[PDB]
Symmetry: C4
Subunit: 351 residues, 4 copies
């Protein structure tokens, strides 16, 4: 019997061909939609629907109270980071709620300290708890999701993550998750892929997770690797219901941290929560910077405008119809020309 063409005799050892955002484009289709008439609302969890399908990352250079307030007023939501004392994180929940009863989420870990943290966040009025781990396919993480749903599931929605396979998504569904968050390795500041050699390209990861979550009516959050407004449309077309953003929002005025004027240009700090500086395990993130991008409200306008364009091109009046759109796969020659190919750019572009 002949060998597998990539080696050995086991045809499942190399189990899939993984695609990322840069591997695909959305195909145009018959349309009665123009960008102005599209409806961008979508489910975050079983019980919570957002006007704009975007949430901010649970990172100490992205989301504290100011970012959470701005995201909710823009039609989305923030998830408050957990690298601070319990009493401080609960106090930031209260600040958001005192600003008009806006929606807000907060991250917790696994264990006894995470349990006390969760209970205080619920008492402060949080709307969504996010069980926030690098590898949710573990009975200890699944147990935390189920116990929270048992104790406080009548008062708050419970998200679990992160996963990158169909079987891991199915395990979170069976544990009672109200939404499943997808992304192992794709983040802009991530080094898991080179430190551990572990990961999963995000378009294939979303397609596989959706195959378990959609038949059960559980929404999927696409978390990490989004670099452009067009990546939001690709993630939702693959079947996700919302997208979580770190790098694209870290440059805004509302993100924590001070402006950095260096060599006449302006930047802000952005770092992984598994970086050496955040942990103070071998590190699995870097510490860096991103260009300054101005007010959050202006960034969200550009991002939703790109999503609305995609809905016009694909004939999608709602996000539920966008989830039925088709892709074409592209080669390396097709990608390299999508970044403005061969024209000395002379003026600024907002998107």
């Amino acid at each position: 019997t002949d060998p597998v063409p990539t080696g050995g005799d086991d045809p499942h050892k190399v189990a899939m061909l993984g695609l990322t955002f840069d591997d695909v484009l959305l195909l145009p289709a018959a349309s009665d939609v123009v960008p102005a008439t599209a409806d961008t609302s979508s489910q975050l969890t079983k019980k919570i629907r957002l006007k704009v399908p975007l949430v901010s990352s649970a990172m100490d250079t992205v989301t504290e109270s100011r970012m959470a307030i701005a995201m909710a007023r823009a039609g989305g939501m923030g998830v408050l980071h957990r690298n601070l004392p319990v009493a401080e994180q609960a106090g930031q929940v209260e600040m958001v709620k005192r600003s008009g009863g806006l929606l807000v989420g907060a991250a917790v870990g696994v264990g006894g300290d995470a349990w006390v943290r969760a209970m205080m966040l619920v008492d402060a009025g949080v709307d969504v708890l996010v069980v926030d781990t690098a590898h949710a396919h573990n009975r200890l993480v699944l147990d935390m999701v189920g116990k929270l749903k048992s104790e406080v599931g009548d008062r708050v929605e419970v998200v679990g993550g992160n996963v990158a396979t169909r079987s891991a998504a199915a395990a979170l569904v069976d544990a009672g998750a109200d939404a499943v968050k997808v992304g192992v390795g794709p983040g802009s500041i991530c080094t898991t892929r080179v430190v551990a050699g572990v990961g999963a390209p995000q378009i294939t990861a979303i397609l596989e997770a959706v195959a378990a979550c959609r038949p059960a009516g559980v929404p999927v959050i696409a978390d990490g690797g989004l670099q452009y407004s067009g990546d939001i449309a690709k993630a939702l077309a693959a079947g996700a219901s919302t997208a979580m953003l770190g790098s694209l929002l870290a440059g805004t005025a509302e993100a924590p941290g001070e402006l950095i004027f260096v060599n006449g240009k302006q930047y802000k700090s952005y770092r992984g929560m598994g970086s050496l500086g955040a942990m103070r395990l071998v590190p699995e993130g870097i510490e860096g910077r991103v260009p300054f991008r101005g007010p959050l409200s202006s960034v969200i306008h550009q991002l939703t405008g790109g999503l609305r364009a995609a809905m016009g091109y694909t004939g999608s009046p709602t996000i539920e119809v966008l989830q039925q759109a088709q892709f074409v796969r592209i080669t390396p020659a097709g990608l390299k020309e999508s970044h403005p190919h061969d024209v000395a750019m002379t003026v600024e572009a907002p998107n």
Copy 2:
């Protein structure tokens, strides 16, 4: 049942593998043709044939009256842009017609203002109206094509675009188009692919559009992404009858705009019609510059000379025979060496 190897259980979710110009080369074939004896004429529309199968883009940094006159004298045609008052665009049609009864086209949009614009262009003597949109697969665009053909179709030829699929091309054929223009996302100044995440590699887009248009006798115009004279031969071999050029003609003396002397070299401005500067919707084009290339007549000579070489290599005495030629697909290793590989270039090359 086993999953699709790229994810999920739907084998049509990723519907095709899209090829662009850099993915293919034309195979040599048995030949009684040398470059001097080839015939480059081809249909622009059902009723109009050109001596050279090239038209200039409807852009305010490419085609006004001077470019339209030069293109017609060289054996091709210009399409006048529509980012100016109706009375000014109609006046430029008259200037061209006063220069020897040369052929000329003009762009119009969709709606009531576009209707008055179209009627004035017809009164001024235009030969071709181009219904000029980003996404022609919409009943409002199809309706405009059909109404123009109904009202003035005896006096003028009507083109519709742009499309990138077989089903969209078929819809324009059924609406009565005299030619179908292909290109969603491929232009050198385009950012649709990153802003909306939407597009289609141009060799596959032409192959699919031709599968609908050729059986109906409707010519296809390949619009956008052509970077070299060899790309013209590839587009026509895929089944197109003419090609539309922006970047390759924006550097010429006849294009609108002033020379730019910077750092001892010379350039000219070139910008998308969906850029912030042209629109004065989130932008879907950039504003930039290209190197100065001299007189139009000299550029067209180099472009047609490359096409004539391809006709010799493939044994094609006419464009209709070139449309029957075959491709070989190449890998990333093959492309990277096609741009002069590993020889410090010391002298200028005209093509």
Copy 3:
């Protein structure tokens, strides 16, 4: 009958599609393992098991007595290079043994001088002889392995290499090898691939060698091409039992050679044993430098920490279970973003 799509009529002329480390990632799986509880021990040979599955290369800029002592104290082993007089190499074996009865190996060639060298190394107390060649699929190399096993196989373990195919691995098994070393062409300082045009991508080479060695109970050593801690996890998941490292250990304090302070940064020399300088045949290696990395103990801690992370993600409590893990294949678009994509790195990272 139709041709093979890549040319000719022989479907076995291009016999396989070869994958390297950068072509694959490990998929996360169901897990009861966290990095702290993983067990990293593994077989070097039939009779020798290591606490950490890493050995240092037999190169005159990587392993003499100081490196061999440090590797053994860290739980791995060193292989002493053979570019020095027999009496000097045997003396370095004694120095290691005088430092606590630590484990040590030593390289030998093929022929009569290599035979006297081997006998002196055995008298000095070496634990492992490595028959060290560029192409072990030769009866002269197979003969050396068998004769050593016949004469001294009761006192010492005998490794043979290097190979890159299933048939070559099977020949070493039949000759009596206690372990088989895999790698023809992959090393960081290797030029065999461009000088001779010969090689085999290392993930496919390991998969093929394991298909012959695992059914016979013979461990496989993955030798060359490892650039990151994650590559260790990939090599072992493909079926290898240990990995051999040159570049990743050449920068350490214990490697032979003096520090190089140039332009404010620090480096150390690193060269192939088939380079012109080492041979003093056309050369098949280069002479270069690598950044200084500090104490060996600190480098091994970072490398094993990355391996432990991979064991947590894949649910592997032992190396024998890691050898059963699955891969996903990635495209060029997926790789280019795994090296920290689009975030100006500002702080140092240890791994």
Copy 4:
């Protein structure tokens, strides 16, 4: 019926997947050969065998009398260029013959002037005439080959080229060619691929030409695209019997032209015969420079040493056995690391 996945309904429109040298490596195999015992002789034509399987290109910056003498003394042969008067080219043939009865070839074109040129070269004692064209699949080129074989075929061997397909090779065989030269588009100074859009990756081109020529006993010359000594071994393993070199020999002392000292380094001019400067048709080559490489004898020693290494690794005692070797295909990740990957090179390498 479903479409072809790359577009349209014709499965032969994209007819093959073309591989170049960088797409493949030679697999090691069972061997009783070391580099010193290999035999590198091979047929140039039906009646002429060379000791080293290499010829120099017919270019006015590569081969005049000095290069032809040095190539013959090294065991190969030169082909004299034809961009000079007939009386001068015939005089250079005589100079070579006066230096010891060495072997020599000379290029001619097609037509009446080429006929007089050919007759004078034969009277001067040339051993091989090369009918030298860009596209030999034409009855006018086939006619020239047949007429020369009819008139002078008893006294001289007749080569025809260039071709890139099985059908074109078969046509030259039927016309009576004594050898067939393969290469449309691959040369380092070629711009045919971008000017005309025409070409064929060279490993696939050789495989296809050999499928026609080997059953007829007609040797194949691989012409263009060879960048490293390892590329010679790849070309011969694909079935060619000799290789023709331009860039790799243009830097030598014996090549025509003067040394160029610029910025402390030394270069020499190298240009295509279809460049603007050589023709004094749109140009299909560039004018450039290459690094100075010293005496020819030293370059040929390095090239044959790399070939001998490949023969050891593949178990080939003769070139006829090397023509039976197997390839593994590699990905972009495998190639990028074959050029010395990630080690600051500090010393010079001869190959």
